């Protein structure tokens, strides 16, 4: 079992500092160059930093030069990324990775190992639980024997929230949408489900919202609205 | 450092076809170009290293070629597991990734089912009104939503997001939220979501009158 495990990520204010660590497991740590690769929500991969096996050579992407510092301590199988004067644009999930490959020569060797990542969120916003509002089924939400209903999970911070329906017993026809980030700095998300309009008066529909950054759990029963 | 430009941005093909993705480098990367595959919510996975070598467990339908500036990833007969985002990555002068190519399942045109949701009374008490328009199960993914409040076009006061391609019918869904203050909201009557999509012969309007 080879494994990279990142930690040290979290919510941090702009201009403040953070330090990520990456602990190796199942591999001769001193033997490979290591890298930090990050990915912002809905964006591509960006190499952040790389450091050789004995820290003899360190490199940084232009977007983090003068602010990040990469180090490693081989005697404890640990790699570090110290980030100073952080900005909102460094909001990303941060991967620890080994990416070695050589075909020189006539011998093929490669090593490609990634952690699951640690999330870094740089923002002025305060941790805050969601409000959960019904998206009620109506005639303007029926279409050919099919009705739509859902929950609006508004004004929470930071990510993530998770949404289930009837404690996971209702999964067919469910769409839980990517949150949007509003002007206020808080996130708004929608989760909808299409159901038979026949069911609207006999079946219970409850969305289960869970927001662990604030330890907020809400169960919201969604009913047709009374006109 | 070296800049990697990938094309096309999005590749729409059905399973069984052949996929060709390109990677152009601003400067020569010799042969140190790798290809990665990423699916949503997962770490990337290495497919090709050093231009043409497949990593272990990679089927031989994946093929990599090129040198210097120009490189190609060929997937000979697409399988459903191959629809994902692909990044090339150079290691000649530090490490940089291309911005990525999205390889998407092409299917028949499907119009969205449109639903509109008035703000809840519960939200209204709080002082804000959120109107939500739902576009359900459509393809292609390009769709346009226009908010109209008593036939006044709303711009800059709404936000939308789009689900990933659905694993069963390969459609998309879109949710758009129009937000107003309670005061502004009760000053108007007709709230309309207008939807244009290739699968619709004419713009579809779903609307309600407040109260």
């Amino acid at each position: 079992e080879e494994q990279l495990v990142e930690s040290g990520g979290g919510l941090v204010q702009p201009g403040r500092s953070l330090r990520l660590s990456c602990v190796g497991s199942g591999l001769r740590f001193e033997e490979h160059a290591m890298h930090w690769v990050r990915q912002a929500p809905g964006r591509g991969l960006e190499w952040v930093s790389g450091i050789s096996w004995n820290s003899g050579s360190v490199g940084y992407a232009d977007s983090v030069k003068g602010r990040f510092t990469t180090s490693r301590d081989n005697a404890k199988d640990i790699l570090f990324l110290e980030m100073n004067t952080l900005r909102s644009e460094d909001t990303a999930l941060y991967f620890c990775a080994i990416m070695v490959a050589t075909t020189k020569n006539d011998f093929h060797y490669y090593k490609d190992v990634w952690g699951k990542g640690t999330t870094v969120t740089v923002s002025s916003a305060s941790t805050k639980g969601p409000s959960v509002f019904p998206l009620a089924p109506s005639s303007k939400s029926t279409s050919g024997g099919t009705a739509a209903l859902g929950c609006l999970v508004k004004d929470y911070f930071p990510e993530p929230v998770t949404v289930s329906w009837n404690s996971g017993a209702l999964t067919s026809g469910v769409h839980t949408f990517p949150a949007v980030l509003q002007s206020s700095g808080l996130y708004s998300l929608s989760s909808v489900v299409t159901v038979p309009s026949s069911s609207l008066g006999t079946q219970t529909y409850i969305c289960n919202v869970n927001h662990k950054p604030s330890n907020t759990k809400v169960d919201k029963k969604v009913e047709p609205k009374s006109c | 450092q070296i800049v990697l430009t990938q094309s096309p941005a999005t590749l729409s093909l059905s399973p069984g076809e052949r996929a060709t993705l390109s990677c152009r480098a601003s400067q020569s990367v010799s042969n140190h170009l790798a290809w990665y595959q990423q699916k949503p919510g997962q770490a990337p996975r290495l497919l090709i290293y050093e231009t043409s070598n497949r990593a272990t467990g990679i089927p031989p339908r994946f093929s990599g070629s090129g040198s210097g500036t120009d490189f190609t990833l060929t997937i000979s007969s697409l399988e459903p597991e191959d629809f994902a985002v692909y990044y090339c990555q150079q290691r000649n002068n530090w490490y940089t990734f291309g911005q990525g190519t999205k390889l998407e399942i092409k299917r028949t045109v499907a119009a969205p089912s449109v639903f509109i949701f008035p703000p809840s009374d519960e939200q209204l008490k709080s002082g804000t009104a959120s109107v939500v328009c739902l576009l359900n199960n459509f393809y292609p993914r390009e769709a346009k939503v226009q908010w109209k409040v008593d036939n006044a076009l709303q711009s800059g006061n709404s936000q939308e997001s789009v689900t990933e391609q659905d694993s069963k019918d390969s459609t998309y869904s879109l949710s758009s939220t129009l937000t107003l203050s309670k005061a502004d909201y009760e000053k108007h009557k007709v709230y309309a979501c207008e939807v244009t999509h290739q699968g619709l012969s004419s713009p579809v309007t779903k609307s309600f009158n407040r109260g």
Binding site: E31, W53, S57 | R91, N93
Partner: peptide, 30 residues
Amino acid sequence: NDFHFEVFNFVPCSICSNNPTCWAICKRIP
């Protein structure tokens, strides 16, 4: 730092086992 490809991409001798080809290009790690 000037980047050189073999500073970041080499084969540790510890995976060569009994293959001469790998022992001819590996890098022993102390």
